[PDB]
Design a binder for this molecule. Sequence first.
Ligand SMILES: *[C@@H]1O[C@H](CO)[C@@H](O[C@@H]2O[C@H](CO)[C@@H](O[C@@H]3O[C@H](CO[C@H]4O[C@H](CO[C@H]5O[C@H](CO)[C@@H](O)[C@H](O)[C@@H]5O[C@H]5O[C@H](CO)[C@@H](O)[C@H](O)[C@@H]5O)[C@@H](O)[C@H](O[C@H]5O[C@H](CO)[C@@H](O)[C@H](O)[C@@H]5O)[C@@H]4O)[C@@H](O)[C@H](O[C@H]4O[C@H](CO)[C@@H](O)[C@H](O)[C@@H]4O[C@H]4O[C@H](CO)[C@@H](O)[C@H](O)[C@@H]4O[C@H]4O[C@H](CO)[C@@H](O)[C@H](O)[C@@H]4O)[C@@H]3O)[C@H](O)[C@H]2NC(C)=O)[C@H](O)[C@H]1NC(C)=O
Ligand SMILES: *[C@@H]1O[C@H](CO)[C@@H](O[C@@H]2O[C@H](CO)[C@@H](O[C@@H]3O[C@H](CO)[C@@H](O)[C@H](O)[C@@H]3O)[C@H](O)[C@H]2NC(C)=O)[C@H](O)[C@H]1NC(C)=O
Ligand SMILES: *[C@@H]1O[C@H](CO)[C@@H](O[C@@H]2O[C@H](CO)[C@@H](O)[C@H](O)[C@H]2NC(C)=O)[C@H](O)[C@H]1NC(C)=O
Ligand SMILES: Cc1ccc(-c2nc3ccc(C)cn3c2CC(=O)N(C)C)cc1
Ligand SMILES: Cc1ccc(-c2nc3ccc(C)cn3c2CC(=O)N(C)C)cc1
Lengths: 106, 193, 104, 80, 333
Amino acid sequence: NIVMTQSPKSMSMSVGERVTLSCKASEYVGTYVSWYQQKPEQSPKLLIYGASNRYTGVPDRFTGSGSATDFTLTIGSVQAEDLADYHCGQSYSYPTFGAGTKLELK
Amino acid sequence: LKFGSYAYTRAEVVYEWTREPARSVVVAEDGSRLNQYDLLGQTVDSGIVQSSTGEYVVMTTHFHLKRKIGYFVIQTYLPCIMTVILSQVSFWLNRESVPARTVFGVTTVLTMTTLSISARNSLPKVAYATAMDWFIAVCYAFVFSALIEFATVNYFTKSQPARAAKIDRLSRIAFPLLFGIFNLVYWATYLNR
Amino acid sequence: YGYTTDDIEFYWRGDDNAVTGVTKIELPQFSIVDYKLITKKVVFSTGSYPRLSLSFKLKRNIGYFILQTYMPSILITILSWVSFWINYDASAARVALGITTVLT
Amino acid sequence: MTTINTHLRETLPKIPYVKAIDMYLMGCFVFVFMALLEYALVNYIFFSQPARAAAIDRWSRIFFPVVFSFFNIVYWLYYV
Amino acid sequence: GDVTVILNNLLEGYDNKLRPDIGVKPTLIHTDMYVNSIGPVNAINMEYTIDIFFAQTWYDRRLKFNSTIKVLRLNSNMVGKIWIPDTFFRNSKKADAHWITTPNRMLRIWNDGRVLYTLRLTIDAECQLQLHNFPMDEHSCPLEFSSYGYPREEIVYQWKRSSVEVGDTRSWRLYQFSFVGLRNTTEVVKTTSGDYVVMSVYFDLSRRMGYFTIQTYIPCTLIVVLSWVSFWINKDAVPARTSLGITTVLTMTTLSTIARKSLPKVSYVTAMDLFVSVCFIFVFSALVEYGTLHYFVSSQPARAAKMDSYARIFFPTAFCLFNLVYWVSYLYL
Ligand SMILES: *[C@@H]1O[C@H](CO)[C@@H](O[C@@H]2O[C@H](CO)[C@@H](O[C@@H]3O[C@H](CO[C@H]4O[C@H](CO[C@H]5O[C@H](CO)[C@@H](O)[C@H](O)[C@@H]5O[C@H]5O[C@H](CO)[C@@H](O)[C@H](O)[C@@H]5O)[C@@H](O)[C@H](O[C@H]5O[C@H](CO)[C@@H](O)[C@H](O)[C@@H]5O)[C@@H]4O)[C@@H](O)[C@H](O[C@H]4O[C@H](CO)[C@@H](O)[C@H](O)[C@@H]4O[C@H]4O[C@H](CO)[C@@H](O)[C@H](O)[C@@H]4O[C@H]4O[C@H](CO)[C@@H](O)[C@H](O)[C@@H]4O)[C@@H]3O)[C@H](O)[C@H]2NC(C)=O)[C@H](O)[C@H]1NC(C)=O
Ligand SMILES: *[C@@H]1O[C@H](CO)[C@@H](O[C@@H]2O[C@H](CO)[C@@H](O[C@@H]3O[C@H](CO)[C@@H](O)[C@H](O)[C@@H]3O)[C@H](O)[C@H]2NC(C)=O)[C@H](O)[C@H]1NC(C)=O
Ligand SMILES: *[C@@H]1O[C@H](CO)[C@@H](O[C@@H]2O[C@H](CO)[C@@H](O)[C@H](O)[C@H]2NC(C)=O)[C@H](O)[C@H]1NC(C)=O
Ligand SMILES: Cc1ccc(-c2nc3ccc(C)cn3c2CC(=O)N(C)C)cc1
Ligand SMILES: Cc1ccc(-c2nc3ccc(C)cn3c2CC(=O)N(C)C)cc1
């Protein structure tokens, strides 16, 4: 059972600048870490499949990276639409998701 | 174990694991023809190969092997330690038995050379120096230092016999303790790795 | 193989410059003294067939072997003579030297 | 002993564990090494009372064949 | 399908026995090469292994097609249907393509009839090593290739600026050699069947002296010093000195025999042989020194002691001097 520790648990960073979400895995999950976006009261939407691959119709500000256990998601410039909960999950083994981190503007 | 498609790029043929990647490469429990290695486990990954002809999907599998040391212990390290001790025992020998001590030293040094040359052939002809190479070198240095010590004793004897006795008695305990310290340091710095 | 001299005949195309590159050949241990091209017919119980033969004369380069084998031999049998210059009173040295030369 | 072991080693593959022929070879090398140590010991006490050195030599003269025979019996009974 | 129709039309009335523009002009073939790995360089057989991805591009007027599909990307199934150049490697002892899981061949055909044909090859190319200066020798030896049956009037090969590219070079099998660099070449060679455009790629390899250092240079030096240790031994114990000298000589001889075996049996002397022979001469000279001392002590011991002390103070200096001379001489040239 791979446990995906996702930090920080929340963010209130200002709009327009860089956002960095870092997801860490207890064991080796080669590149099967995915990033899902969950706007309030709505199903999650896939953003990053594998490590550092973007899904169809995703803003180009989103980009991920990570090799063995340290994976991160970067947003070039926040937008009003990016105010959502982000979850990192691994699919190297039976799926397990991270705690999910909330993004806030202020 | 990397594999993928020849002549079809990511835009045409893509590879994926049939089931969960962690469970997609299965090793038969009884199937292991390794003699000097232990298979700790396997790891899989999927990636891309950047080529002048295009971008190709490559599926990777890594088999983690840890070398077993029993054979190398028996064939190199225990013989080397035994040769070192065989050189050491000459100190307890009589000073007046100059031929005896000379025979011990020369035979031990020849024995260290033959072990060195026989141990180097087993592994490939790599340029760098391996851990076994350092162990062999240090054991060779110890035996050669024992030879130098005997030479110094024979040089002093009949001129300053008290000095010869002092140096021989000091060596009798300096050499074994230094060898033990080196052995502990080497085994700690390599095994705990 | 299957065709006798009533069906096939072999010859060297040029008969002198039919085999080329022998001069450019290099061997670690041999030197090609010369080569010859022969034409003939060999008879078997099944019939007579055309045979061509290409033969090389190879001479061994002695230089390697001298130092590799003879020199240790020449020395060992020279040192074996050192026992003569030592006084016969000292048995151990002379006996060891001779017998170890024999072992070598 | 070293050369016999080297000839044996060349034929066989690299295996971690210890074989019966390997056990016999360690036993025999131990015996040879112990004989050498015994000689060194008698030489050490040579300047001291030679009677003790002679007694040690006499003890060895009879014990070493006996101990080797017992070791052979044990080894050959274990593996058969 | 549309591609099925196109491929059926291309092969209809197609003679793969005849090269493109057979009676018109030489077929110009552009060749690239990706050096995946340069395998071991074993001098005993005087060869070296290399794994490459060979690519060849030429134009086939018969393969022109008009359709929205701009390139026909095909597997090895078509390789044997169209005409393929008969490129072969002239200095290959033995080479084979790869066949697992299927033939490692690719074929791409464009609208204008251009054909790209790549395949994976491992070649045991043979190149003569001049083992003078070994193990300080540097070598730069080729991988030549040409058309087997088509002279320059019918097939011409041509390189590209970025034709030859190399892999990472860290996973390569070169242990005693280092890859300095490569250069390419083209020329015409006269052959019994005509003149052929011969294309060459030279791989410059520099030897690593680190391994052979450990193997032979350190052991010989330390056996020489072992021989030295005889001089400080007392003059009285004749068996001691004789045993030391003979043991050094035997170890030196066996070390020389084994060390040479690492090298192909060549009739010329190598830099490695010279150092070994010098050390062997040094140990023999130590034996002769003790023998002369033994003969001269009976006549008078004072001269024997004087010359023994002189030898003790000299021999290390002589060995150091000869080491310096040898090393500088064989590093400069
Ligand atoms: C003295 O006797 C010797 C012994 O007989 C003799 O050697 C033999 O020579 C013949 C002819 O030269 C060789 O046959 C050729 O082999 C080529 C491949 O060579 C390599 O592989 C074979 C092994 O073959 C198996 O694996 C290959 C690899 O994929 C497959 O292609 C084969 O189908 C076969 O697979 C079977 O076997 C597997 C395991 O055994 C099974 O798991 C599998 O399920 C299959 O049952 C090796 O033997 C070769 O090794 C030898 O050669 C090398 C040479 O360097 C030596 O170094 C080495 O030491 C060995 O000696 C080698 O590794 C084939 O490509 C070739 O077939 C093509 O060409 C012929 C001629 O035109 C066609 O008839 C044929 O149909 C093939 O063309 C089709 O395929 C190509 C793709 O390759 C297409 O591009 C082409 O367009 C065409 O496609 C069309 O047809 C297809 C039907 O096939 C169809 O599907 C398509 O859709 C399309 O319509 C030929 O068979 C034979 O291997 C030699 N054997 C040995 C032991 O040497 C020697 O020459 C004699 N000497 C003299 C002087 O006479
Ligand atoms: C290597 O060995 C071969 C075979 O023994 C040698 O070939 C021999 O060459 C001689 C001279 O060319 C042949 O003699 C000829 O015999 C015919 C028979 O009619 C005669 O008419 C000629 O006047 C001549 O005397 C001999 O037959 C031939 N041997 C065989 C078996 O055919 C060869 O010379 C040797 N050396 C080299 C460098 O090849
Ligand atoms: C490989 O071959 C190509 C083509 O023959 C060489 O390309 C030349 O590179 C030089 C740069 O040194 C240019 O000045 C020439 O104009 C190039 N020629 C062409 C036709 O483009 C290349 O130098 C070769 N690489 C080697 C020898 O290492
Ligand atoms: C001149 C040339 C250059 C490259 C190729 C080539 N074609 C492919 C197809 C697939 C795969 C995985 C690797 N290929 C390579 C080699 C490569 O680029 N590697 C190893 C990084 C062929 C000919
Ligand atoms: C299975 C085996 C048995 C013996 C050896 C061996 N070879 C040597 C050569 C030289 C010297 C000094 C000691 N040697 C020993 C000693 C040894 O290993 N013992 C005592 C367990 C190696 C492997």
